[PDB]
RNA sequence: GCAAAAACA
């Protein structure tokens, strides 16, 4: 399992001028984090950060504007 | 493509004009020319031997090669000295009147050409400003350099210019007026330097090409040898300059005989020729006509200098690390052109054997023609640069095959190497192509490479209309266009001409003419066109008065000599108007004063050249004579 | 005269002296040569395989329609369109983000308000590639890794698309209007009358076709875009593509938006945002286009938006697209005049049956339809001109000549290493119309008896 | 993104 993240032991992606930039977005922009791994890290259905109860979601310009469904925090490292 | 090949009432030869990418943008060359220039330089070294040994070929100097070594299965650079001598002898023995007229040219009018005609050339890389300058500017700077560093005044003849170049090349140190100094080796390298650039607006091939221009110092020698080549080419039936294709078309052969017709091109035409073969050809002709020795050097120096060419390799190869790109000169990092690293001389590179486009397009044709002249080649040949057509008139098919094969071998003898894939031979004569012309039975069809612009040239309404109609007339005269095409093209040109000069719809000019009750009386104003297909060779103003479409009062108003604003067969009028770190814009204005005082004093210069000996202050002699 | 060390300078790079005097006896040696070959087979062009090449042209071509607007000026029509329409995106392409519809609507409103040039908005950032060079350069510098190597560029091969035949058959459709309004020249002699009659007949047989309307649209769009590139600006300019039918009504083909376009060199690209009224959307034909739904007067229209940059030379060339009419006119005039030279009779209504190879069969068809299809194919070739097309046509002239020779009962001979098909094949990479012409050549018989 | 053997952005 290659680290690909700062908390996993990978090389720092943040610099002095990039203190304000998010790690995942900056790594995606620089190519240090491929899309296949992005599809796994940012999964809104991962068991790691799954919520115990369903949550309500807006639906902009839809026949049913509110949908309630199970949700997880997108990042698997926000446990 | 099946729609471009009719089977009834019309043959594919005439409709082959449809196989042209007209009206579409011409391919444009992007980026560095370094890869193309390096490939052009490296091709002749790869074809010297049957087995490709590049490294052995970088030190050959003279490109003469032995027989049983010319690549007969592929491209072969170099030449055979004995073959060149024999073919030049054979060519000299034939076409005697052409040689006599060449002798006339070289004895009488050779020491007569004015050296100022080098100003109407091509873009020149100045060796003093270290950049590109127009040809007149380069000529003026070079003659100023010669005057400063040689102290003898340059005569009107270009022989004086050549002598000045030769004399100044022997000085160990030269300084220009600023006040920059040149060493003799530096000046020699600058003379060797060839400025290469992309060839633009080139249609007809997938890959872009680079052309090279010589320095102004050697341009006089190049021009004299090119003029001699042109003069000898105009008077030989096998040249590609005149109706030769039509003349050979109007030929009747034996009733039952094999009459071939070979039409083909040349592959690597500028990548397989050596200037030494041209040297041998010119020396043989000059020696067997009987010219003096100084003529020998005068005609041999250009190829001597070209044998040491220093063609600039553009801006550098393109290297990519990741998504980055960088331009790197040859030799900094390994590439596919590592064998030429040893020949890198600063930004330029040295190549002893090889050629470049735009240098000698006539002497190469002469070399091909002297190759044509043999004994068993009892056929008709027309050669123009890299394109040729050959007619075989023999008795047996195997005789025709032998003639074609020996033609190919003799072309290879001097290193012409016609493309096998581009050469097509037809057993019965009647179908062929040469230049952009197409041959079918007794008819030859001229098909243009480019359509007429059909747009105003962009100087003034009368001039633009005259040039457009003249271009259409020239196109229809050459057979490229006919009644319907000519009329349609002139209608299109009329529409574009009216649009470009605010004569269509509602605009500032139309509103100004409408509010002031100014009736549009000319085509550029918005009036109905007066020119027709038959009358397209007539001036607009002259044609309108005869038809009563332009009142004599209007002619008096417009044709007034005292008018604020003031081949082109258009009368001057009020519509004849001109549209509105260099450190050189001041001296063009002070040269304007010199040109302004002239053409006001001398009607003579508007007739002939300025042939006044001396005449530095001496212009006062005329003004005093005017008073007297 | 010549100097002393100058001779050394001349001789330092050649074996011979200034004036060569070879000591070898002049003679031409006898060299063994190969045998000239003969071919029964006409060359068969290889067909490149891969994804079908998408539509790569400045405008839409066949899928070009217009909105009929009430008679008036350009500003009136633009105001009518902006005030009587709503836009909702149907298909979104990653190449052209759907946010550029904001730029298009802003340009429409500004043009309706009498301001053809408008100030920049935020959506214009990703609409014209503003600061895209700096973005890419800095991103590449930040993410650079490894070591330098040669550029080793590559061009992806693509197969013949299925829509080229659809394009050819759709440009043939009849139209109600003439779409070709060229002012007639004067007539003084009877030969002038002959020329004008030929031109009028050609115009009336090709004018009422879809290809003529598309040519008019291309000419107007390119001319309007080119007339604004000269002025070095930093603000977005709008150039509507509007024509008039012979009843006063305004026909809105689309709008082209010109970005800052700080152009210096004559070949430099200029940012463009082209909006067009499309007839039928296709994913594989328009992968880089964003298609929007358009609702005017309870009618259905498709609006296509694409982000392109286009050089000044190409725009100037396409502003003179009307020159494409010459070659079909040449063919028509030659046929008509041949059937006037046969019997000294200029009929000006001769419609011979032209025999051609259709779907691998030899059948005949009328001259008018043939001229129409020649015009359509020539327009497609002109709008798809690149080095591939140039080389393909130049090297196909020889094969066309050989095919004509073997139809006229002649023998064709070739040198030793003669493979004329290779030079045509090297130019067939991804051009849709080059592939179309290659397939048309392949469909014809390669043996003639 | 345009365009092809690298230029514009």
UniProtKB/Swiss-Prot annotation, chain A:
It comes from the Viruses. Signal peptide: none annotated. Belongs to the influenza viruses polymerase PB1 family. RNA-dependent RNA polymerase which is responsible for replication and transcription of virus RNA segments. The transcription of viral mRNAs occurs by a unique mechanism called cap-snatching. 5' methylated caps of cellular mRNAs are cleaved after 10-13 nucleotides by PA. In turn, these short capped RNAs are used as primers by PB1 for transcription of viral mRNAs. During virus replication, PB1 initiates RNA synthesis and copy vRNA into complementary RNA (cRNA) which in turn serves as a template for the production of more vRNAs. RNA polymerase is composed of three subunits: PA, PB1 and PB2. This is RNA-directed RNA polymerase catalytic subunit. It comes from Thogoto virus (isolate SiAr 126) (Tho). The chain holds residues 554 to 632 of 710 of the full protein.
Swiss-Prot record, chain C:
GO terms for cellular component: host cell nucleus; virion component. It is found in: Virion; Host nucleus. GO terms for molecular function: RNA binding. It comes from the Viruses. Its main location: virion. The keyword DNA repair does not apply. Keywords: Host nucleus, Virion. One of its GO terms (biological process) is viral RNA genome replication. subunit of the RNA-dependent RNA polymerase which is responsible for replication and transcription of virus RNA segments. The transcription of viral mRNAs occurs by a unique mechanism called cap-snatching. 5' methylated caps of cellular mRNAs are cleaved after 10-13 nucleotides by PA. In turn, these short capped RNAs are used as primers by PB1 for transcription of viral mRNAs. During virus replication, PB1 initiates RNA synthesis and copy vRNA into complementary RNA (cRNA) which in turn serves as a template for the production of more vRNAs. RNA polymerase is composed of three subunits: PA, PB1 and PB2. Belongs to the influenza viruses PA family. This is Polymerase acidic protein. The chain holds residues 174 to 622 of 622 of the full protein.
